[PDB]
């Protein structure tokens, strides 16, 4: 990490030191220089820490003069990497063209250096570690510093534009992961005019992204916008109003399985939703979710209303029959016990709820094999993580099935204990109605904000509210232990003093007062101050908490939902069949672009 | 105070009018000035109220023909101070240097002035009496107001530059001492040049500050950028990155048992926190935070919480027999009492309670033993005072610690009682689990928000909140002392009716309402009005306070946070053993920088 680097500089640097000819490179004393290179005895192959050779330490300092009587008295330097583990690739071409010395490179390419020389070492793979990433081949990073001129020149001298990286991107795919300057979107047209002829726009890399692919993932919207600006065709201008036919070719991706807008959506970039506000893919996306996306959606929204509806009075109408042994016990106030299966379906209403439970049971299966395929296709920490493709509902429908699965094993095999996952059951699929709240504009960005403080701001409140709550239950418990049971049993024993003081943190009871009897002091004395520290300061500044975080957020939860009926309206289609689901956009037949199809979109402009 | 110097500016002004030389050098007429000049019969030593000469009063309007006309009847007065107590060390040079007369210095040091003289008087001293906080030599007067030439002027003419006032401050640190302005920071580089050799830069004052350590301390950011741009070496520049080594010699401060970072951070100053974040320190602090400080801070809270467990356990477990005496009396209900030593411990139980008590006292000695030396080392306002070392949390485990010390007397001499301290110190300790939530980005800057607001917001709404306690406490107990207590036995006397009006204030009971009886009227009316003016006015006021508090404060909050890990960090090194706590940073024996250890810093730059 961070302490390898600097070990590595220091052994760079003390390799430098202690050796004459290297520290002459450094400093760039021409007399010692000359003294040195005036020698004949060995050859001129002494490194560094790394394998550097002295050109390497000449380019790093900008020794021009260095670098041309180096090469003058060795002039295969030029061919010679370094070889140690940061830098396994690294040659002085490199350090040539990053430091855009223009001249050095002239001077580096008349002697005869690699062109096609890839920089392997671990301080330029696409790393958190390094703090760029120029690529590997010394047309990527002529490319990536801005030179147009040392770009050509390489051009000119070889420089095979088609080559890849380990990671397998080419040089398009290196200038659309740069941050967003001016000479980057440029560059790309340069690079472009050497094109000549496949392509290179249609190579993808070891992740099988194309590079109009890779710019829709990684949020570079001022690339994705100028890449259509060469994927449209204007058809008339009659007036203030304009028709633009947009290429819906890479965008929509009808016969390939993994779609340009799946590859947008599922991404964990906060820029990728941006892509999604631009003018060919907004319409598009609005097209498909105003006509198909909206009415199928609400179709199985009130599916899945009513299948709660069946398994709610199916819960409710469930089989139980009197206790069979007597209580002989106070305290205990339970009277009816679960039936067994020989005696749980003997009437019709036992049919009913029968056929209702199979239709249960068939809706649990329809779940399962409906979201298994999704956890094997995408990756499980990419369906769970992701908020836009609705990670929670997924997570708690696959756990609601599998509860309503092990309720239907404990109704085949008779187990005392439905009561415990018919209640989780009954929790987690009533909530996971809160998913069909996203595809309206009233209840899905307040889901959305729920989902955002129970993640972020609800664990902050009870990582401190449950140490208040342990220490004034300890408090209770120890006041009140000494007191009988039967005039005030709120903390009468410890699992009872830590949920009644918790209900008294939030005041959804009344504080524990009977007057009928002499309460101890110290009591009232550290309810006081609990009622002073928790219920007036910590609930009222947790509302304070909602309240500031919903409006630092509320500027993200607008543009998030509409970034999430997007990963709706695409989980619509490639799972529905395709009847239900027709090609959006016109042929371009008719325009004599071929085989494409196309959006029109009619905007005008003044 | 005020009125002092109000009554030496009346006296002065009356000793200036009554005396003829010193109001013909106030407001300047020759004539008068060439008569009274032209005597001869006594020396020209005529005073004010202070003891000011008449150079002083020509000095101090700008006078410089009246001045040079007196220093040509008497050249002696350039040597006279004046005497009196505000200004007992102020010369002529001092007045002529502060208000820039330039000519007026030259004539002054003409005549043999004295260029060491100190003005130690009250005016002059470092309090916030004084506006100003020049020093007390000229040169430093010079080197404050800015001009150039008069302290070159000083220089060639003496003004020996490590002079010390007294308070021990040198030229530079009166220079830190500025407001920041333009010239503040190259006069420091003016007044660096001639230092020409042991420095000024290492000479400390009478606090032993370095002016590097009270650049850190003063919360001067510019002074102590400016002073890290001599202190910093850069390697090389190999296209848009470049490394720096920073030293960390007078930053880390490894052998010194007062540190740079400790002298920071424990400052009472608003702007030293800012220091933290500049580019030498910041990046030192997150280093010996997210490699040392956080695991060994999640260890240590995990150690914390374990023993906080224990003591529940042994809180809950406490021996406690049936009670002897039958109670023979109604309203009372305690059914327990608390064991004897003799009879505490029987059982095996009570051998695992016995060496949890060990276990739990161990714990408490511990925390006295580490924290009544830093009550002795650093100051005990200072080190209470600060919330950024974590003074309420310091506080409150001390007399957790005093508290279950108490509890362990009252256990060995058998007292009945120990359910007020060992309440408390549930609590006390419980709450004192929340000193570690500052290691994380979630639990930090809430838990400050809180302190601010036991300090801020609380005693603000409980100097009210009492008040209206108090009196409709007094109301409810006049309109229920003429009923049955057994009815509604809220307001039965007056320390119930001040408990159940504070219940009623906070909404945690119900309101008292019994509808098999007839209430009083007045009860009704008066309760109407609590209801309005408290629960429904000061109550949501309070959220509304609290709110509009949390958004003004919130951009201070988390800058906050980031300068108290640096508190923790800094904690955490010189009380754990070295050998935990490597030496941060990276010998410069390989670079050629010597002893001296140096943080690199990789920074990119377009």
């Given at each position: 990490?961070?302490?390898?680097?600097?070990?590595?500089?220091?052994l760079?640097?003390?390799?430098?030191r202690?050796?004459?000819?290297?520290?002459?490179?450094?400093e760039?004393?021409?007399?010692?220089?000359?003294?040195?290179?005036?020698?004949?005895?060995?050859?001129?192959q002494?490194?560094?820490?790394?394998?550097?050779?002295?050109?390497?330490?000449?380019?790093?300092?900008?020794?021009?003069?260095?670098?041309?009587?180096?090469?003058?008295?060795?002039?295969?330097?030029?061919?010679?990497?370094?070889?140690?583990?940061?830098?396994?690739?690294?040659?002085?071409?490199?350090?040539?063209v990053?430091?855009?010395?223009?001249?050095?490179?002239?001077?580096?390419?008349?002697?005869?250096?690699?062109?096609?020389?890839?920089?392997?070492?671990?301080?330029?793979?696409?790393?958190?570690?390094?703090?760029?990433?120029?690529?590997?081949?010394?047309?990527?990073?002529?490319?990536?510093?801005?030179?147009?001129?040392?770009?050509?020149?390489?051009?000119?001298?070889?420089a095979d534009?088609?080559?890849?990286?380990?990671?397998?991107?080419?040089?398009?795919?290196?200038?659309?992961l740069?941050?967003?300057?001016?000479?980057?979107c440029?560059?790309?047209?340069?690079?472009?005019?050497?094109?000549?002829?496949?392509?290179?726009?249609?190579?993808?890399?070891?992740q099988?992204?194309?590079?109009?692919?890779?710019?829709?993932?990684?949020?570079?919207?001022?690339?994705?916008?100028?890449?259509?600006?060469?994927?449209?065709?204007?058809?008339?201008?009659?007036?203030?109003?304009?028709?633009?036919?947009?290429?819906?070719?890479?965008?929509?991706?009808?016969?390939?399985?993994?779609?340009?807008?799946?590859?947008?959506?599922?991404?964990?970039?906060?820029?990728?939703?941006?892509?999604?506000?631009?003018?060919?893919?907004?319409?598009?996306?609005?097209?498909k979710?105003?006509?198909?996306?909206?009415?199928?959606?609400?179709?199985?929204?009130?599916?899945?209303?009513?299948?709660?509806?069946?398994?709610?009075?199916?819960?409710?109408?469930?089989?139980l029959?009197?206790?069979?042994?007597?209580?002989?016990?106070?305290?205990?106030?339970?009277?009816?016990?679960?039936?067994?299966?020989?005696?749980?379906?003997?009437?019709?209403?036992?049919?009913?709820?029968?056929?209702?439970?199979?239709?249960?049971?068939?809706?649990?299966?329809?779940?399962?094999?409906?979201?298994?395929?999704?956890?094997?296709?995408?990756?499980?920490?990419?369906?769970?993580?992701?908020?836009?493709?609705?990670?929670?509902?997924?997570?708690?429908?696959?756990?609601?099935?599998?509860?309503?699965?092990?309720?239907?094993?404990?109704?085949?095999?008779?187990?005392?204990?439905?009561?415990?996952?018919?209640?989780?059951?009954?929790?987690?699929?009533?909530?996971?109605?809160?998913?069909?709240?996203?595809?309206?504009?009233?209840?899905?960005?307040?889901?959305?904000?729920?989902?955002?403080?129970?993640?972020?701001?609800l664990?902050?409140?009870?990582?401190?509210?449950?140490?208040?709550?342990?220490?004034?239950?300890?408090?209770?418990?120890?006041?009140?232990?000494?007191?009988?049971?039967?005039?005030?049993?709120?903390?009468?024993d410890?699992?009872?003093?830590?949920?009644?003081?918790?209900?008294?943190?939030?005041?959804?009871?009344?504080?524990?007062?009977?007057?009928?009897?002499?309460?101890?002091?110290?009591?009232?004395?550290?309810?006081?101050?609990?009622?002073?520290?928790?219920?007036?300061?910590?609930l009222?500044?947790?509302?304070?908490?909602?309240?500031?975080?919903?409006?630092?957020?509320?500027?993200?939860?607008?543009?998030?939902?509409?970034?999430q009926?997007?990963?709706?309206?695409?989980?619509?289609?490639?799972?529905?069949?395709r009847?239900?689901?027709?090609?959006?956009?016109?042929?371009?037949?008719?325009?004599?672009?071929?085989?494409?199809?196309?959006?029109?979109?009619?905007?005008?402009?003044?």
């Amino acid at each position: 990490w961070e302490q390898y680097r600097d070990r590595v500089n220091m052994l760079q640097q003390e390799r430098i030191r202690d050796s004459p000819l290297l520290q002459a490179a450094k400093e760039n004393d021409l007399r010692l220089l000359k003294i040195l290179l005036l020698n004949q005895s060995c050859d001129f192959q002494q490194r560094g820490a790394v394998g550097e050779t002295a050109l390497h330490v000449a380019a790093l300092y900008d020794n021009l003069e260095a670098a041309t009587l180096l090469m003058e008295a060795a002039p295969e330097l030029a061919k010679e990497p370094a070889l140690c583990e940061p830098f396994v690739g690294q040659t002085a071409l490199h350090i040539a063209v990053m430091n855009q010395n223009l001249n050095l490179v002239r001077a580096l390419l008349a002697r005869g250096a690699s062109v096609s020389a890839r920089a392997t070492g671990a301080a330029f793979r696409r790393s958190p570690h390094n703090l760029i990433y120029y690529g590997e081949h010394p047309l990527s990073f002529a490319a990536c510093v801005g030179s147009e001129e040392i770009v050509r020149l390489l051009i000119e001298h070889g420089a095979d534009i088609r080559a890849q990286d380990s990671l397998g991107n080419t040089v398009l795919h290196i200038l659309i992961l740069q941050p967003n300057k001016t000479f980057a979107c440029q560059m790309y047209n340069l690079l472009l005019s050497y094109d000549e002829h496949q392509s290179l726009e249609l190579v993808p890399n070891h992740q099988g992204l194309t590079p109009f692919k890779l710019a829709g993932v990684e949020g570079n919207t001022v690339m994705f916008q100028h890449l259509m600006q060469k994927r449209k065709h204007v058809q008339w201008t009659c007036g203030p109003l304009t028709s633009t036919l947009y290429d819906l070719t890479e965008i929509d991706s009808w016969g390939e399985e993994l779609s340009f807008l799946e590859l947008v959506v599922s991404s964990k970039k906060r820029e990728a939703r941006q892509i999604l506000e631009q003018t060919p893919v907004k319409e598009l996306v609005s097209f498909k979710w105003k006509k198909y996306g909206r009415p199928y959606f609400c179709v199985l929204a009130s599916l899945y209303i009513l299948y709660m509806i069946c398994f709610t009075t199916c819960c409710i109408y469930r089989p139980l029959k009197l206790r069979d042994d007597n209580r002989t016990d106070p305290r205990d106030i339970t009277i009816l016990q679960q039936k067994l299966l020989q005696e749980a379906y003997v009437t019709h209403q036992d049919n009913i709820r029968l056929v209702g439970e199979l239709v249960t049971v068939t809706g649990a299966v329809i779940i399962l094999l409906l979201e298994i395929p999704d956890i094997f296709r995408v990756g499980a920490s990419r369906y769970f993580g992701q908020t836009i493709l609705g990670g929670p509902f997924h997570v708690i429908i696959i756990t609601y099935a599998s509860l309503v699965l092990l309720t239907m094993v404990m109704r085949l095999t008779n187990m005392n204990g439905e009561v415990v996952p018919l209640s989780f059951a009954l929790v987690l699929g009533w909530c996971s109605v809160m998913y069909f709240a996203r595809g309206f504009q009233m209840l899905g960005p307040f889901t959305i904000m729920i989902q955002k403080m129970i993640f972020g701001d609800l664990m902050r409140f009870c990582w401190l509210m449950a140490v208040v709550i342990l220490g004034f239950a300890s408090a209770f418990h120890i006041t009140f232990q000494t007191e009988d049971p039967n005039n005030l049993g709120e903390f009468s024993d410890y699992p009872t003093a830590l949920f009644s003081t918790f209900e008294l943190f939030l005041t959804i009871i009344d504080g524990p007062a009977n007057y009928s009897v002499d309460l101890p002091f110290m009591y009232c004395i550290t309810y006081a101050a609990f009622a002073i520290i928790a219920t007036l300061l910590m609930l009222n500044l947790f509302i304070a908490m909602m309240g500031d975080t919903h409006w630092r957020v509320a500027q993200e939860r607008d543009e998030l939902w509409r970034a999430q009926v997007v990963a709706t309206t695409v989980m619509l289609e490639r799972k529905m069949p395709r009847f239900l689901w027709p090609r959006s956009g016109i042929c371009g037949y008719e325009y004599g672009l071929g085989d494409r199809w196309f959006l029109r979109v009619e905007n005008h402009h003044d």
